[PDB]
Write a protein that binds this ligand. Structure first.
Ligand code: KJM
Length: 141
């Protein structure tokens, strides 16, 4: 699906950031990483919204209160994914500021802690994406 390809581009970019390789460390001190992640996030959410809209052209008819609940649950799962991606962006903005405040000192232990926290944020984003995919897969029925 288009939205899954978009999310995959976000996910591959963030897997690269997770390596904290030399070029990642460079781009993390500019706005480049968080700006490129915002663009990838925005594209994912836009495709998600269009996909839901197109699914609603091919629904199995059910009771109005049942359809309304399923649409609400799907809306909340979309919001969770967007919030996860923002949490990742925000944590990398925080890293930038904490490095500046070190005034040139070693960032090795900042990066160890960032790597650890990024792993947890990414586990959360992955489980929310899998839950959203499952909900979309049964939505039309
Ligand atoms: N095949 C998957 N598990 C999906 C996926 C793909 C890439 C990255 C992520 Cl986080 C999730 C597609 C929606 C769930």
């Amino acid at each position: 699906q288009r939205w899954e390809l978009a999310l995959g581009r976000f996910w591959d970019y963030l897997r690269w950031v997770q390596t904290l390789s030399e070029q990642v460390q460079e781009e993390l001190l500019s706005s480049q990483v968080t700006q490129e992640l915002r663009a990838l996030m925005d594209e994912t959410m836009k495709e998600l919204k269009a996909y839901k809209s197109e699914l609603e052209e091919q629904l199995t008819p059910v009771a109005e209160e049942t359809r309304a609940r399923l649409s609400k649950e799907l809306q909340a799962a979309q919001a969770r994914l967007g919030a996860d991606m923002e949490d990742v962006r925000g944590r990398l903005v925080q890293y930038r500021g904490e490095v500046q405040a070190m005034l040139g000192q070693s960032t090795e232990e900042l990066r160890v802690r960032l790597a650890s926290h990024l792993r947890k944020l990414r586990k959360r984003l992955l489980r929310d994406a899998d839950d959203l995919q499952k909900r979309l897969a049964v939505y039309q029925a």
